[PDB]
Each structure stands twice: as C-alpha cells, then as structure tokens.
Amino acid sequence: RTRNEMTAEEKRRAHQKELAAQLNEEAKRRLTEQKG
Amino acid sequence: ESYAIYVYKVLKQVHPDTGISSKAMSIMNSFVNDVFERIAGEASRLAHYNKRSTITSREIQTAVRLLLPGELAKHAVSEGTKAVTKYTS
Amino acid sequence: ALETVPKDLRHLRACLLCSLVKTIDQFEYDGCDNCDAYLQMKGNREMVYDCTSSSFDGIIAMMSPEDSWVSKWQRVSNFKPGVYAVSVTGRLPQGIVRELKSRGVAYKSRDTAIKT
Amino acid sequence: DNIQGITKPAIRRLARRGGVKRISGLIYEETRGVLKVFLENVIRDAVTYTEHAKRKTVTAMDVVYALKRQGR
Amino acid sequence: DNIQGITKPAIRRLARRGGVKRISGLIYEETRGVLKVFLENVIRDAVTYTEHAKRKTVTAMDVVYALKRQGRTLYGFG
Amino acid sequence: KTRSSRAGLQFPVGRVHRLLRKGNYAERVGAGAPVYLAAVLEYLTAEILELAGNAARDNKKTRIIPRHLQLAVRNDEELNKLLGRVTIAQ
Amino acid sequence: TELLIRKLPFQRLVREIAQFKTDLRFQSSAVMALQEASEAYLVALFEDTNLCAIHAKRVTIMPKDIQLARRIRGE
Amino acid sequence: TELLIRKLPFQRLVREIAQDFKTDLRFQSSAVMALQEASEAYLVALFEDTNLCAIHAKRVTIMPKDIQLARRIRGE
Ligand SMILES: [Zn+2]
C-alpha cells in the first residue's frame, strides 16, 4: 500500500564503499612512498 | 491507553520479520496522537466554517489534503476512500 | 485653516482631481484633504508622486466656493477653501482611474487650458 | 510571464515605506521570488478550501481561511 | 538562585552542538535569561492545564500540551 | 463484527469515534468520517514503519529504534516537511 | 486600504500561477484580500531585512539580508 | 546521545520557577525530563539562529545582540 519509493542510495553506498577502499589504498601508498 | 497494539499489528504486517524498541513505540504513539489531533482540529475548523453539525468523510478528506504534503496526502486520500468503500460495502 | 495654506513656495505640487496646491511636506504628512478616503494619498510620498504632478499653472485664493463664479466655472464648489490652480497637465493610470468610477468618483480633466 | 509585469517601482514603493533607506540591484528578483512563493502557498490553501466548498469561484472568505490556516 | 546552576560548560556544549565556534562572555547570562523566560512560559501553561484537570501534580501530558501550545511538539513522553 | 473488521482496517474505528466525540470537535460525527480518519492514521503509521524497517535493515539490526525512525524521517522529504517542528526524546 | 502593486498585473500573476486547478474564478474581494495580505507580508519581510542590514552595519539591504530573514523565520 | 544540561541544576531551576509560580507543587520525573529535552532543543535552535546572525554580521564570536536579533526575527 505504502508509497514504496526506492533508494539508489544503496548504489551510492556501494560506490562509496569502493571509493573508501580506493582511498585507503592510495593514501597508504602515497604515505609509504613519502616516508618523510 | 495507546495505539501500541495496533502499531505492532501494522509493523508485523509491513515487516513481519523485525521488532521495535520501547522508545520507538512511544514515538510512534506520540506521532499517532499528534496526527489524530491535527486532523481533528482542522476538521473542526472546516465544520465551523461550513456551519455543519457533523464531521463527514468530505471534511476529513479536506483536512488531510490541508495537512499532509501532496503525494502523501493523495495516497492517504486513496487509502481512506478504499477503506470507506469496503466499510459501506 | 493653517494646515492647507502653503508654507514654502519652493517644492510645490498640485493634484489633478480637485486641484489642491500645497507644499511637498504637507502632501507627505497630511496629504490630499478634499479627497483622502478615495485616494489614500496620505501616509507616503509614493502615492503623492504617482497621482499628483508638478505640471500646473495658476494661483487663485479660493475662499467662498459656495458663492463664486470661478468655483462654479472650475467645478470646485463642493470642495473646501484653499489655494487651487487653473491648469494641471496630466492623467492618472488606468488602474488608478478605473477604481474611481467603480467606487463612484467621476474623473474629470481639470486642464482647462487649451493646446495650440 | 507576469512576475516581471509586477512593476519594480511597486516593489520599491513597498520597501520604501519604512526604514529601508537604500536598496541593491538584486533585491527586485529576490522580492519577486518571495512574493511568488507566498502567493503560491496562499492560493493552494484557498483552492483547497474552494474545492471543499464545491464552489467554482474562490472567495474572500476562502482567502481569509487560507490566511488563518497559514497563521498570517 | 538556581538559574546560575546552569553550568558555563553546559551552555558552551549546547552552543557547540548548535554550531558556534567562538562564544562571548556576555552570552551565558543572556542564555540563562532566555531559558528562564521559556521555562516560565512552559510552566505557566502547564499549571493552567493542571488547574483545568484539577490534578495535584504536573504530568508529562500537561507538559507536552504546553509545548504544543507554544509550537514545539515533543514526542516520547506521550 | 467490529467496525474495524467491517472496514477491514487495523486501527480502532470505535476508539477514534469515541475520542472525536469526547474532544467535542463537532456536535456529531458521520459514519464514514471515523472510518476515513482511522484509515488515514493507519496508512501514515504503515508508511512510517516501512521506512523505519528499511533503515533498520540498512543499519543491520533486528529491532527498530529511535535512530532508525529519525533516519527515516530525515531521508523522506515529505515526512521532513511534515514533522519539521517536531521534537523527539533522546 | 493603500495598495502599491498595480491591481491588473497582480491579478494577471494570480491567474497565471493559479494553474494548479485550471479554470477558476476569483472574486474581486478575494483578489483584494490576497493583495492586502501580500502587501503586508512583503512589508514585514522588508522590515526584518532592514533589521538584518542594520545588524550587519549596512544601510543598503542586499539579497542576503532577505535570505537570512527568511531562514530565521522558517520559510 | 546524552543530556547536555546538568540534571540536578536543571531540576532545581524547574522547582524554583514552579515555587515562584505556585508553592506546594510536584512534578513527575518524566515531566522534568520532557522539560529538559524541550529546553535543550529550544536552546540549540536559538544557538543555530544566533550563529547564522553572527555569520551574516561577518564575525566569529557570537554576541548578545545576535541572540536578540534572532529572537526578534523569530517573533518572540
Ligand atoms: Zn485633488
């Protein structure tokens, strides 16, 4: 009965999980390459 | 008293595999009472404007359309129409 | 009265309905006296600048409109005493002139002067 | 397009009636948008009241009810 | 008085949750005064409702009705 | 059978009618007015609970909580416009 | 009583924006009441704007003044 | 989540204002909690408005004049 409106937000969350994984990887890589 | 039993029934019907919290049930009851009061106050205003001595389905529909937003109001109006039809049936 | 007599000769306008010549300060504070309810000219300079117009000529010391050929000719016998003029060039907007007739106020052209 | 027809001199007159000693060049479009929003809300309320009353003509009474509902 | 009981750190924490980065010294007394006015109005309405219901003690329902009258509905305590 | 069962709704049509007549919102109340009001209340409650259960399944929980209710209310634009001036405990 | 907006443009705007339900007459008194309400509303908004401008220490009101007024008002 | 106002001072203030209004009164625990929640919400809303006023005034420090302008524009 409920409106029943869906949410691509789940696709957004998945895309954001991928972005967070890539972000952690790249941050670790750049900091290890820097090493002061 | 409160509408806790009815809220629990609706919850089991919409999501038969989930629960709720005590604060959540209280918030739902407060919401139910508030919506009831708002619609009743709007209906009383409309009846006093029309100089009527009985709140009718037309008054309730007008109150709902004045309170709730567009799409939500239309869906609620459809649900109420179906309900009153099944009742009069 | 002392409220309708112009105070300072500089900065002076005149109406188009009853042709009430006064000072800008008087028009802003008190406004049109002969026609106030059907004009709302009082309480702001905006309606003053909208209706009245500084394009007018002539000065007559009107003191007895009930008994005066100048008032009978100028059609100001039903107005209060004051300093009026003999010509006022202008015209009110359509929205301002239609409401006059709708409420029951006959709009006439006070510009008795001729053209060419 | 009548939102532009609303003479800017009219907005300036409405603003000049108190305190407003100086106005910018963008106030006109902003005031027009705000007036549009307010009119849309009031007219929606009045149209709801009229459809409830069944009449096909909005009335000053319906406008007053809409204003009271909005709390104006 | 107990109006001063409202701790300076409590007002600072309220302002932080709101979104204020730097507070002035004259803010705490003013916030206390505003809070006192609001509580006075709410208690006024609540005592009116209590006298209407002819009850000996103020209740969460009366407080909720007073808050509604003010224009700030509060769920949870219903 | 009960008017609730007659109308097929889940909210109490009888309690709604009694509350209306007790508040004295009007000298009388029709027969369709209370059924309609109960239906509107039930639809609103069903929508709120649906959004709350959706938020709960997203958060990975087995019981709805005020957090899920808040998330649902602030994610639905219409519910936000409806309960903007509403406050909740905790 | 006093009206600053021209009644004809105002009526045109009302009938153009009242397309939510096409074909609906508006009595003269209804349009007049709407115009009075709109004039009073814009008057209050400009007063709040002047307050925001005086606060900002600027004698000239700017769109951000009106924006802040409406934000604090809850429009 | 947690309460930002101290429960005991807030309760003492509530009792003080209640005695000022009418003596020999008693409030419920839930009533005092609801009052505290409503007061915290009201203060947070007021602080958000005051922060907007200060932002507009091109400042960082919030001022009692900002609070006054917020209350005025709100209409209290
Ligand atoms: Zn004149």
UniProtKB/Swiss-Prot annotation, chain A:
There is a cross-link at K35 (Glycyl lysine isopeptide (Lys-Gly) (interchain with G-Cter in SUMO2)). Ubiquitous. It is found in: Nucleus; Chromosome. ADP-ribosylated. ADP-ribosylation by PARP1 is induced by genotoxic stress and correlates with dissociation of FACT from chromatin. Component of the FACT complex, a general chromatin factor that acts to reorganize nucleosomes. The FACT complex is involved in multiple processes that require DNA as a template such as mRNA elongation, DNA replication and DNA repair. During transcription elongation the FACT complex acts as a histone chaperone that both destabilizes and restores nucleosomal structure. Belongs to the peptidase M24 family. SPT16 subfamily. It is linked to Neurodevelopmental disorder with dysmorphic facies and thin corpus callosum: An autosomal dominant disorder characterized by global developmental delay, impaired intellectual development with poor or absent speech and language, and autistic-like behaviors. Corpus callosum anomalies are visible on brain imaging. Most patients have dysmorphic features including tall forehead, down-slanting palpebral fissures, ear anomalies and broad nasal bridge. Other variably present clinical features include seizures, sleeping difficulties and precocious puberty. The C-terminal Glu-rich acidic region is essential for FACT activity. This is FACT complex subunit SPT16. The gene is SUPT16H.
Swiss-Prot record, chain B:
One of its GO terms (cellular component) is nucleus. Monoubiquitination of Lys-86 by BRE1 gives a specific tag for epigenetic transcriptional activation and is also prerequisite for histone H3 'Lys-4' and 'Lys-79' methylation. GlcNAcylation at Ser-78 promotes monoubiquitination of Lys-86. It fluctuates in response to extracellular glucose, and associates with transcribed genes. Core component of nucleosome. Nucleosomes wrap and compact DNA into chromatin, limiting DNA accessibility to the cellular machineries which require DNA as a template. Histones thereby play a central role in transcription regulation, DNA repair, DNA replication and chromosomal stability. DNA accessibility is regulated via a complex set of post-translational modifications of histones, also called histone code, and nucleosome remodeling. Transmembrane segments: none annotated. Keywords: Acetylation, Chromosome, DNA-binding, Glycoprotein, Isopeptide bond, Nucleosome core, Nucleus, Phosphoprotein, Ubl conjugation. This is Histone H2B 1.1. The keyword Glycoprotein applies.
From Swiss-Prot, chain E:
Its main location: nucleus. The modification N6-propionyllysine is found at K8, K21, K54, K56, K68. The modification Phosphotyrosine is found at Y28, Y65. Keywords: Acetylation, Chromosome, Citrullination, DNA-binding, Hydroxylation, Isopeptide bond, Methylation, Nucleosome core, Nucleus, Phosphoprotein, Ubl conjugation. The modification N6-succinyllysine is found at K8, K54, K68. The modification Phosphoserine is found at S24. Demethylation is performed by JMJD6. Monomethylation is performed by KMT5A/SET8. Trimethylation is performed by KMT5B and KMT5C and induces gene silencing. GO terms for cellular component: nucleosome; nucleus. It is found in: Nucleus; Chromosome. GO terms for biological process: nucleosome assembly. The keyword Cell membrane does not apply. GO terms for molecular function: DNA binding; protein heterodimerization activity; structural constituent of chromatin. It comes from the Eukaryota. There is a cross-link at K8 (Glycyl lysine isopeptide (Lys-Gly) (interchain with G-Cter in UFM1)). The modification N6-acetyllysine is found at K8, K36, K56, K68. There is a cross-link at K68 (Glycyl lysine isopeptide (Lys-Gly) (interchain with G-Cter in ubiquitin)). The modification N6-(2-hydroxyisobutyryl)lysine is found at K8, K21, K36, K54, K56, K68. The modification N6-lactoyllysine is found at K8, K54, K68. The keyword Transit peptide does not apply. The modification N6-glutaryllysine is found at K8, K36, K54, K56, K68. The modification N6-butyryllysine is found at K8, K21, K54, K56, K68. The nucleosome is a histone octamer containing two molecules each of H2A, H2B, H3 and H4 assembled in one H3-H4 heterotetramer and two H2A-H2B heterodimers. The octamer wraps approximately 147 bp of DNA. Belongs to the histone H4 family. This is Histone H4. It comes from Xenopus laevis.
Curated annotation (Swiss-Prot), chain F:
The modification N6-glutaryllysine is found at K81. The modification N5-methylglutamine is found at Q90. The keyword Electron transport does not apply. There is a cross-link at K1 (Glycyl lysine isopeptide (Lys-Gly) (interchain with G-Cter in ubiquitin)). GO terms for biological process: heterochromatin formation. Following DNA double-strand breaks (DSBs), it is ubiquitinated through 'Lys-63' linkage of ubiquitin moieties, leading to the recruitment of repair proteins to sites of DNA damage. H2AK119Ub and ionizing radiation-induced 'Lys-63'-linked ubiquitination are distinct events. Glutamine methylation at Gln-90 (H2AQ104me) by FBL is specifically dedicated to polymerase I. It is present at 35S ribosomal DNA locus and impairs binding of the FACT complex. The modification N6-(2-hydroxyisobutyryl)lysine is found at K22, K60, K61, K81. Its main location: nucleus. The keyword Electron transport does not apply. The modification N6-succinyllysine is found at K81. Core component of nucleosome. Nucleosomes wrap and compact DNA into chromatin, limiting DNA accessibility to the cellular machineries which require DNA as a template. Histones thereby play a central role in transcription regulation, DNA repair, DNA replication and chromosomal stability. DNA accessibility is regulated via a complex set of post-translational modifications of histones, also called histone code, and nucleosome remodeling. Belongs to the histone H2A family. The nucleosome is a histone octamer containing two molecules each of H2A, H2B, H3 and H4 assembled in one H3-H4 heterotetramer and two H2A-H2B heterodimers. The octamer wraps approximately 147 bp of DNA. This is Histone H2A type 1.
